[PDB]
Design a protein around this ligand. Structure first.
Ligand SMILES: CCn1c(-c2cnc(C)nc2)nc2c(-c3ccc4c(c3)[C@](C)(Cc3ccccc3)C(=O)N4)ncnc21
Lengths: 163, 925
C-alpha cells in the first residue's frame, strides 16, 4: 500500500523544466508591466489632483476679480471711463477661456487614466490565468526530480536535464 | 525651444499670459511681469514686487510659495506654467519647510491628510513634535556638541615621527612640522599656535578645531592621531596630512547659517465575509476566500474557508466565518489574514490576492464594524503557502483599481474593549535534577512539541540560568492562550538585559509582540554610532514587519538620526530609495517627514543631492536614447553639451556626496565625464576639489551590491579589530531611488582583463618601481586573501577578469556583486596568476605562500567567531525581498560556508582541505 525508464522520465524532466522557465519568464514580463502600470496610474492620479488644484486657483481668481472689480467698474462709470471698464472685463474673459483649456486638458487625462485602469485589470487577469499553469509546472518538475533522486540518479545527470 | 508661455494671476484678479525663458529665475520673471502689468488694468493698486511671492502648483500637486527667487523656472517644475501673486506674510518658515519636505521625500504631505486616518495623524503630530524639540535643543548647545552632531569622528576600528602641514582659515602661508603619531590632537593645535605666535603674539588651543583640507572631516576628542582615518591613511601611504585650524566662532557660523475587560469575553472569534470587488479571474472557475488567525508566523487556530461562488468582478458571500479560538485568548498582535483563491469547481489552485488585518488597533482597541481591505496580488513563490501572514498589514494604496474584500467584525460588548493594560497583565502573570540536565542539552535548532512543554514548565529556570535563550522560550509560549501569554510577559518584564547580538535576533518577524521589540531596542541602546551604522540597513528593513506606525524601532532610529547627522544622512537614503514601493511609501514618508523637521540643515544638503540625482537621471536617459542611434564619441560629446547648460552644470556642481557626506563634489570635470558600455549605460562623473568620481546607475537594483559591500566592510572591521588589516576596498554603494543609485569610483585602478594585454607582475613593477614593489606585492597578498575568503563565505561566483580589479598600490578588489549565496556551493577558489604574484614571480616560494595561507585561515577563523552576527543580520535582510535572500535555505548557505555546526578545529581542517584542493584546481584551469 502507497512509472517508466530513467531516460524517459529524465527527458520529461527536461521538457517540463524548459516549460516552467518559459512560463516563469512570461509571468515576470506581466509582473513588470503590472508594476509599471501601477506606478503610471498613481502618477496620473496625482497629476489629476494637480489639475484640480490649478483649476481651484483659477476659480479663486474669478471670485477675486468679481468682488474686487465692482468699485472700479462703478467708479469709471460715473467718471466716464467705459473704456477702462471694457479692459477689465475683456481681461476677465481671457481668464475664463484659459480655464476652459485647463479643464479640457484635465478631461483628456481622466480619459487616459480610464483606459490605463482597464489595462491594469486585464494584466491582473492574464497574470491570474497563468498562475495555475506556472504552479502546476513547478510541482510536476519537482515530482520528476524527486522520482529520479529516489531511483538513485546522480546529481550530474540531473543538472544536464535541468539545463 | 527655451521659451514657455506663463499665466500670471495678479491679486487684483487681472490675468496676463506671456513667454519667458525656462532658464530665467523667478526674480527676473517678476521684473518682466511688472514691466508688462503696468500696461494692464488696475496696476496702480498693486504694492511693489517685493511685497508679493509667486505661488505655483508643484509636481506633487501641492501649492508652493516660492520664497527663493534665484531658482530657475525649469528647476521649480510647476505642474502647469501658472504663477499666482499672493501676499508675502504668514508663518513663512513652516510653509517653506512643509513645501521642501514634499519635494524631498517624493510624496506630497497632503497625501497623508487625504487618508483621514487617526493613526497617521497621531504619528505626525507626536513625531514631528519630538524631532522639532530635539532640533531646537541641539541649537542651544555649544559648538562642541554641534561639531559632534554634524561631523562625528571617523576613526579606525583600532611611535613614529612623521610630519604634518598646518594652515589657518583665510591664509596663504602654511606650517610644516613633525609631531608624534600617538600625540592627541590638542597638542597639534597648541603647537601651530606657538608657530603662529613666534613667527605677532596669543589665545588658547581649545578655541580651535582641526579640519582636513577640502573635506568636512574634523580631528578632535581624547583619541591619539594615528586612530583617525585620514591620518592612518596618510601615514600608510606616506603622504603628509594637510590640516586647517578653524576657530570656534567659525563653527558657530555653520550652526547659524471602559468597564468591560477583554478576558471576560469567553465566546469564539468570528467575522462576516460580505463581498469582494474588482476581482479579475477566470470566468470558468469559482472563487474562495481562505482566512486564518496568526501571531507572527504561527497559527493561533485552524484556518477556516468561505464557500465557492462563481467568478465575477463583484462576488458576494455573506458568510459567518467562525474560528476555533475565544475572543479572550487573542494576543495583542493577533493578525487576521486573507487569501482570495480561484479554484476549479469541486467535481493548481490560483492564489489571486491576499490581505492582512490587525484585530486590535494602534490604541489597543479590539476592532468592530466594517473594513474594506484593498488586496495585494499573490506572487507564485517556491514555498506555496495558502496565506501570507508575514505580509504587511497596510492596505494596498491603489484604492482606485486594486481588488478589495469587504468584511465586518461584529460588536461583542456594549462598550468598547481594550487589550488589558500592563498592570492587569502582571497581575495575572504571577505564578528536579533530571529535568535540569534535560533543559541544558535542549538549549544547544528547531524545537519539537515534547521539548516545547519542558522549556515552558522550566521557564523560571530559563530566566535564572539561560537568559540568552529568551527567543527559544518566546517561540514555545502558546500565544493562543491569554494565561500563558500573561505568564511569558511577566517573566519578560523582569528579564535581564541581553547583548546586542541577541537583541538583533529578537527583531525578526517571529517575535511580533510589542513588549519583545521594546526589550530588544532597550538592548540595542548600548550601540555606539559606529556599530549601529554597521546594522542600519538591517534595522530599516525590519520596519516592514511592524504592525503600527508609532513603534519603538522607529523612535529609536529617529533618536539616533537626530543625535548623529551621518546616521541621519543614511537613514534618509535607505528610506528615500524605497518611496516608490507602495507597501512602504506611507510608513517611510512619515519617518522621512519627521526626520526632516528635526534636521533643517541637512535638509539643505539633501535638497542639493536630490537635484543632482534628477539631472543625472535625465542625462542618463538621453545617453541610453543616443547610444542606440549614434556611435560613442559623438554621444560622449552630446552628453557634455547637455552638461554645460547652466541649470545642469549648477545642479551637478558643489554638493556633498550622497556616498559620503563629508566628501565635497566641487567642480564637474566635464571632459573626463563619460558612460560605461554595460547594458544600463551608467554614467562616469568626475569631480575636482582640494580628484573624486561617482557612477550613476539607472535600470538595475543596486541593493544586492550594497548588502554585499556592507558585509565586506563588516568583515574588514572584524578583521581589523583583531589587528589584521587585509587592505580591503569596501567602496561606497548607495541606492537612491527606483532602480537608481551611486557607486564610488575607486581611483587609479584597472580591470585584470585590461592589464592582461606575467603582465600582472610587470604592471605592478611599472606602478611601483624599485623598492616600492615589496609593498605592492604584500598589498596584493593581503587583499587577495581577504577577497578569497569573503567571496567564498558569501557564495559570490562568476568571479572573472572583467569584474576583479587592481589598484596601483597592489590592492586587489572585486566589483559587480549581482549574485551571492551560490545564486550549488561555490568552491573556495585560488587563481594561478594571483599565486604567481604572491610568490614574487617564482615557481616555488613556500615562505610567502604559507603566509598567504595563514592570512586566509586567520580571516576565516575570525568570521566564524562572529558567525551568529552574520546569520542574524542576513535573517533580518529577508525583509528586503531580494530574490537571492528569500528563504532559510539561503541562510543555511552561510551556516555551511562558515561551518558553524562543527568545532573550530574541525572547521579549520575542512577549510584547509578546501584550500589545498583550490591550489590543485588552480593549475588545472
Ligand atoms: C568600484 C566602482 N567601479 C566600477 C563598478 C561599476 N559597476 C558596478 C555595479 N560596480 C562597480 N567599475 C569601476 C572601474 C572601471 C571598470 C571598468 C573599466 C574601467 C574602470 C576602465 C579602466 C575605464 C573606463 C572605460 C570606459 C568607461 C568608464 C571607465 C575600462 O576600460 N574598463 N573603475 C573604478 N571603479 C569602478
Amino acid at each position: 500500500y502507497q512509472e517508466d525508464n530513467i531516460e524517459a522520465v529524465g527527458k520529461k524532466l527536461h521538457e517540463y523544466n524548459t516549460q516552467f522557465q518559459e512560463k516563469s519568464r512570461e509571468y515576470d514580463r506581466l509582473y513588470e508591466d503590472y508594476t509599471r502600470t501601477s506606478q503610471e496610474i498613481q502618477m496620473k492620479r496625482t497629476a489629476i489632483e494637480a489639475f484640480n488644484e490649478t483649476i481651484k486657483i483659477f476659480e479663486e481668481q474669478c471670485q477675486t476679480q468679481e468682488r474686487y472689480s465692482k468699485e472700479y467698474i462703478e467708479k469709471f462709470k460715473r467718471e466716464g471711463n467705459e473704456t477702462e471698464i471694457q479692459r477689465i472685463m475683456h481681461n476677465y474673459e481671457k481668464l475664463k477661456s484659459r480655464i476652459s483649456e485647463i479643464v479640457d486638458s484635465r478631461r483628456r487625462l481622466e480619459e487616459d487614466l480610464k483606459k490605463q485602469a482597464a489595462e491594469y485589470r486585464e494584466i491582473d487577469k492574464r497574470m491570474n490565468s497563468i498562475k495555475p499553469d506556472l504552479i502546476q509546472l513547478r510541482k510536476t518538475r519537482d515530482q520528476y526530480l524527486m522520482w529520479l533522486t529516489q531511483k538513485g540518479v546522480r546529481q550530474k545527470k540531473l543538472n544536464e536535464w535541468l539545463g | 525651444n527655451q521659451s514657455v508661455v506663463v499665466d500670471f494671476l495678479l491679486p487684483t484678479g487681472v490675468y496676463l499670459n506671456f513667454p519667458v525663458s525656462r532658464n530665467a529665475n523667478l526674480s527676473t520673471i517678476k521684473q518682466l511681469l511688472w514691466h508688462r502689468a503696468q500696461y494692464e488694468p488696475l496696476f496702480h493698486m498693486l504694492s511693489g514686487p517685493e511685497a508679493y511671492v509667486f505661488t505655483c502648483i508643484n509636481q506633487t500637486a501641492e501649492q508652493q510659495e516660492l520664497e527663493d527667487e534665484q531658482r530657475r523656472l525649469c528647476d521649480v517644475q510647476p505642474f502647469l506654467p501658472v504663477l499666482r501673486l499672493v501676499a508675502r506674510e504668514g508663518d513663512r518658515v513652516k510653509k517653506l519647510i512643509n513645501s521642501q519636505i514634499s519635494l524631498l521625500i517624493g510624496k506630497g504631505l497632503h497625501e497623508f491628510d487625504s487618508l483621514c486616518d487617526p493613526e497617521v495623524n497621531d504619528f505626525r503630530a507626536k513625531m514631528c513634535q519630538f524631532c522639532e524639540e530635539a532640533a531646537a535643543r541641539r541649537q542651544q548647545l555649544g559648538w562642541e556638541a554641534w561639531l559632534q552632531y554634524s561631523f562625528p569622528l571617523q576613526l579606525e576600528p583600532s611611535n613614529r615621527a612623521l610630519l604634518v602641514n598646518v594652515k589657518f582659515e583665510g591664509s596663504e602661508e602654511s606650517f610644516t612640522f613633525q609631531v608624534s603619531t600617538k600625540d592627541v590632537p590638542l597638542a597639534l593645535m597648541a603647537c601651530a599656535l606657538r608657530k603662529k605666535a613666534t613667527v605677532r603674539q596669543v589665545e588658547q588651543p581649545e578655541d580651535y578645531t582641526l579640519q582636513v583640507n577640502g573635506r568636512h572631516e574634523y580631528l578632535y576628542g581624547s583619541y591619539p592621531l594615528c586612530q583617525f582615518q585620514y591620518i592612518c591613511s596618510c601615514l600608510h601611504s606616506g603622504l603628509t596630512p594637510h590640516l586647517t585650524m578653524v576657530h570656534s566662532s567659525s563653527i558657530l557660523a555653520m550652526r547659524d547659517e471602559s468597564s468591560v475587560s477583554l478576558w471576560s469575553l469567553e465566546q469564539p472569534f468570528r467575522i462576516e465575509l460580505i463581498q469582494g470587488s474588482k476581482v479579475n479571474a477566470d470566468e470558468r472557475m469559482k472563487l474562495v476566500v481562505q482566512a486564518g488567525l496568526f501571531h507572527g508566523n504561527e497559527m493561533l487556530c485552524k484556518t477556516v474557508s468561505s464557500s465557492e461562488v462563481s467568478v465575477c468582478s463583484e462576488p458576494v458571500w455573506k458568510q459567518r466565518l467562525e474560528f476555533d479560538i475565544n475572543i479572550c485568548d487573542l494576543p495583542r498582535m493577533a493578525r487576521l489574514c486573507f487569501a482570495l483563491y480561484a479554484v476549479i469547481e469541486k467535481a493548481a489552485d490560483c492564489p489571486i490576492a491576499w490581505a492582512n488585518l490587525m484585530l486590535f488597533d494602534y490604541k489597543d482597541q479590539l476592532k468592530t464594524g466594517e473594513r474594506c481591505l484593498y488586496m495585494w496580488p499573490s506572487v507564485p513563490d517556491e514555498k506555496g503557502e495558502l496565506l501570507n501572514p508575514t505580509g504587511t498589514v497596510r492596505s494596498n494604496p491603489n484604492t482606485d483599481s486594486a481588488a478589495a474584500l469587504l468584511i465586518c467584525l461584529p460588536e461583542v460588548a456594549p462598550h468598547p474593549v481594550y487589550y488589558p493594560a500592563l498592570e492587569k497583565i502582571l497581575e495575572l502573570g504571577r505564578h528536579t535534577e533530571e529535568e535540569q540536565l534535560q533543559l541544558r542539552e535542549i538549549l544547544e535548532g528547531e524545537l519539537y512539541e515534547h521539548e516545547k512543554d519542558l522549556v515552558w514548565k522550566l521557564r523560571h529556570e530559563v530566566q535564572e540560568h539561560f537568559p540568552e535563550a529568551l527567543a527559544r522560550l518566546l517561540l514555545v509560549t502558546k500565544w493562543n492562550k491569554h494565561e500563558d501569554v500573561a505568564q511569558m510577559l511577566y517573566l519578560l518584564c523582569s528579564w535581564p538585559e541581553l547583548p546586542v547580538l541577541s537583541a538583533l535576533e529578537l527583531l525578526d518577524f517571529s517575535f511580533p509582540d510589542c513588549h519583545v521589540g521594546s526589550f530588544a531596542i532597550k538592548s540595542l541602546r548600548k550601540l555606539t554610532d559606529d556599530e549601529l551604522f554597521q546594522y542600519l540597513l538591517q534595522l530599516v528593513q525590519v520596519l516592514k514587519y511592524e504592525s503600527y506606525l508609532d513603534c519603538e524601532l522607529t523612535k529609536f532610529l529617529l533618536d539616533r538620526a537626530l543625535a548623529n547627522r551621518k546616521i541621519g544622512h543614511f537613514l534618509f537614503w535607505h528610506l528615500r530609495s524605497e518611496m516608490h514601493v507602495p507597501s512602504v511609501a506611507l510608513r517611510f514618508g512619515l519617518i522621512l517627514e519627521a526626520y526632516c523637521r528635526g534636521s533643517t540643515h541637512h535638509m539643505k544638503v539633501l535638497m542639493k543631492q536630490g537635484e543632482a540625482l534628477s539631472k543625472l537621471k535625465a542625462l542618463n536617459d538621453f545617453v541610453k536614447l543616443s547610444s542606440q542611434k549614434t556611435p560613442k564619441p559623438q554621444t560622449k560629446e552630446l552628453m557634455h553639451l547637455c552638461m554645460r547648460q547652466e541649470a545642469y552644470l549648477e545642479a551637478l556642481s558643489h554638493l556633498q556626496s550622497p556616498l559620503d557626506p563629508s566628501t565635497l563634489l566641487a567642480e564637474v570635470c566635464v571632459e573626463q565625464c563619460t558612460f560605461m558600455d554595460s547594458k544600463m549605460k551608467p554614467l562616469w562623473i568626475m569631480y575636482s576639489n582640494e580628484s573624486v568620481g561617482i557612477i550613476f546607475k539607472n535600470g538595475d537594483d543596486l541593493r544586492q551590491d550594497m548588502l554585499t559591500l556592507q558585509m565586506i566592510q563588516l568583515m574588514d572591521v572584524l578583521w581589523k579589530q583583531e589587528g589584521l588589516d587585509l587592505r580591503m576596498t569596501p567602496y561606497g554603494c548607495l541606492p537612491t531611488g527606483d532602480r537608481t543609485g551611486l557607486i564610488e569610483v575607486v581611483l587609479r585602478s584597472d580591470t585584470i582583463a585590461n592589464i592582461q594585454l606575467d603582465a600582472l607582475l610587470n604592471w605592478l613593477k611599472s606602478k611601483n618601481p624599485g623598492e616600492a614593489l615589496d609593498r605592492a606585492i604584500e598589498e596584493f597578498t593581503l587583499s587577495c586573501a581577504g577577497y578569497c575568503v569573503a567571496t567564498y563565505v558569501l557564495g559570490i561566483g562568476d568571479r572573472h577578469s572583467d569584474n576583479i580589479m587592481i589598484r596601483e598600490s597592489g590592492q586587489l578588489f572585486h566589483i559587480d556583486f549581482g549574485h551571492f549565496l551560490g545564486n550549488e556551493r561555490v568552491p573556495f577558489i585560488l587563481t594561478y596568476d594571483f599565486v604567481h604574484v604572491i610568490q614574487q614571480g617564482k615557481t616555488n616560494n613556500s615562505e610567502k605562500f604559507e603566509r598567504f595561507r595563514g592570512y586566509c585561515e586567520r580571516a576565516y577563523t575570525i568570521l566564524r567567531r562572529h558567525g551568529l552576527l552574520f546569520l542574524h543580520l542576513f535573517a533580518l535582510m529577508r525583509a528586503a525581498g531580494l530574490p537571492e535572500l528569500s528563504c532559510s535555505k539561503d541562510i543555511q548557505y552561510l551556516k555551511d560556508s562558515l561551518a558553524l555546526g562543527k568545532t573550530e578545529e574541525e572547521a579549520l581542517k575542512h577549510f584547509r582541505v578546501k584550500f589545498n584542493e583550490a591550489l590543485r584546481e588552480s593549475w588545472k584551469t
